[PDB]
Write a protein that binds this ligand. Structure first.
Ligand SMILES: CCCCCCCCCCCCCC(=O)SCCNC(=O)CCNC(=O)[C@H](O)C(C)(C)COP(=O)(O)OP(=O)(O)OC[C@H]1O[C@@H](n2cnc3c(N)ncnc32)[C@H](O)[C@@H]1OP(=O)(O)O
Ligand SMILES: CCN(c1ccccc1)S(=O)(=O)c1ccc(Cl)c(C(=O)Nc2ccccc2N2CCCC2=O)c1
Ligand SMILES: [Cl-]
Ligand SMILES: [Cl-]
Length: 426
């Protein structure tokens, strides 16, 4: 039974009612608490200085997450985010310094808690809005099960609402409240023997070692030409590429797409904010379209769809008129292999956003797989979001352990298919 989430504007696991399928759960621009939340005696809030990669805050945050962030259910693996990755994932265009939130023990000066928000722009059906993503929530193992996490959630909620933002998106490896979709990870295994020794994959009973190796082998015999690393001067062309992609796969009419409700212009008023409520005739109306996605301006594109060693890879294809026609991208995270002396870490690539116009999506993903292999990744991960089932189906991808639950704070989204979701979190 919930003692915190029962009190919050989210869809509850037992709730189903309103005649509107989409729109804000509440419109409360004036009534939210603005006084900072108290921590237990001996603890203090701090704004975490990730603006200097050499700072002590950055070292403490890196160590905190290294030893206390997300593990798989069997506690065999734990993410080991690099400082360069954290800098890229959190020091994003428009970021606020007070949205990087730490908890420090006064007596020891040790950082024992972290929570972060980043600003993003999204479309949800017939509305657009500036919103937030909450990520990297983390409490030190010795402080778990003491109801500290709700204090962190309430505090970042306060700091986001002070910027006039009243919704947030987050994902979780667990069922908390009712998720609006569930994402399933799939693996393309690159280094079979290493990942078998690390316990990331098993070998089945009626299969020889050489059969498992051959099963997962990458043929680099079929290649397609013209892909190159993106550079900053590609940002206008990439921006238009994403615009055209989201127009192609939108779940609303051409008329609505050109008259999207801008929630930021009405969220100050209970009366006007009601304009964001929308009924859905039938769920099948959404089939195979995107219902919710991130939106990128040129500054965003320059930040995210770049190339940073061991962090993010983005390649683009050009036509002879130097139009950019295709894009693949993936980010990279190292994970600790807990208590493994032989292979103490593994390197996993994660599909980010991909746009195939002049080749098939399998062909695009094949060039990306080869590129991930060339970036010393041990496996390539893809969710079944967007159109990624076209590459998972009838392929060598194998299912991952765990499920990603997608959540929206203070908005109503009907339960939808992951193919209707274009939100990738770090
Ligand atoms: C407008 C703006 C809104 C902004 C806010 C939007 C919401 C953002 C929400 C956060 C987005 C996170 C996105 C990411 O970063 S997902 C990754 C989260 N981090 C980890 O899994 C790392 C390892 N685990 C830990 O560090 C701790 O176990 C954490 C800190 C997760 C919980 O610490 P602890 O184990 O010591 O528990 P507690 O006794 O203090 O508190 C128990 C309460 O906390 C609820 N709980 C537990 N885990 C989660 C969770 N992952 N999301 C939301 N709620 C969670 C739980 O249901 C229960 O409440 P209720 O069931 O009684 O009701
Ligand atoms: C052994 C397999 N893996 C693993 C699991 C836990 C820790 C370290 C590695 S895995 O293949 O990476 C994998 C597969 C399925 C799931 Cl559901 C997850 C997972 O927990 N996600 C997740 C959960 C909460 C917060 C962030 C993430 N994250 C961060 C990055 C992207 C993302 O989803 C990971
Ligand atoms: Cl308080
Ligand atoms: Cl609580």
């Amino acid at each position: 039974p919930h003692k915190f989430w029962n009190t919050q504007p989210v869809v509850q696991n037992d709730d189903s009612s309103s005649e509107y399928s989409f729109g804000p759960i509440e419109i409360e621009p004036d009534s939210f608490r603005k006084e900072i939340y108290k921590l237990p005696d001996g603890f203090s809030w701090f704004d975490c200085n990730l603006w200097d990669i050499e700072s002590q805050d950055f070292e403490d945050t890196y160590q905190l997450l290294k030893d206390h962030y997300v593990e798989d259910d069997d506690s065999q693996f734990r993410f080991n985010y690099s400082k360069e990755f954290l800098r890229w994932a959190l020091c994003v265009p428009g970021q606020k310094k007070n949205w990087l939130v730490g908890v420090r023990v006064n007596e020891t000066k040790k950082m024992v808690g972290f929570i972060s928000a980043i600003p993003i722009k999204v479309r949800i059906h017939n509305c657009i809005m500036n919103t937030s993503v909450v990520n990297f929530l983390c409490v030190h193992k010795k402080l778990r099960s003491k109801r500290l996490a709700p204090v962190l959630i309430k505090e970042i909620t306060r700091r986001i609402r002070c910027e006039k933002i009243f919704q947030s998106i987050y994902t979780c490896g667990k069922n908390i409240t009712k998720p609006f979709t569930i994402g399933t990870y799939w693996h393309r295994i690159i280094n079979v023997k290493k990942l078998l020794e690390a316990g990331f994959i098993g070998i089945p009973r009626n299969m020889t070692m050489s059969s498992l190796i051959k099963y997962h082998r990458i043929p680099a015999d079929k290649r397609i030409e013209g892909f190159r690393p993106s550079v900053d001067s590609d940002a206008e062309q990439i921006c238009k590429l994403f615009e055209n992609y989201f127009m192609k796969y939108k779940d609303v009419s051409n008329e609505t797409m050109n008259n999207l409700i801008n929630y930021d212009e009405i969220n100050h008023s209970k009366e006007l904010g009601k304009q964001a409520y929308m009924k859905l005739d039938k769920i099948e109306d959404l089939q195979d379209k995107i219902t919710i996605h991130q939106c990128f301006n040129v500054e965003d594109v320059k930040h995210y769809f770049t190339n940073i060693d061991k962090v993010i890879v983005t390649y683009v294809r050009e036509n002879k008129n130097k139009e950019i026609t295709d894009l693949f991208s993936f980010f990279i995270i190292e994970s600790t292999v807990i208590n493994n002396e032989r292979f103490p870490t593994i390197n996993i690539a994660y599909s980010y956003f991909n746009i195939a116009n002049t080749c098939s999506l399998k062909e695009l993903f094949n060039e990306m797989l080869i590129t991930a292999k060339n970036n010393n990744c041990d496996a390539f991960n893809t969710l079944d979001l967007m159109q990624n089932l076209q590459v998972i189906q009838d392929s060598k991808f194998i299912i991952g352990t765990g499920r990603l639950r997608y959540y929206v704070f203070n908005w109503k989204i009907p339960q939808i298919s992951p193919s209707n979701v274009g939100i990738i979190l770090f």
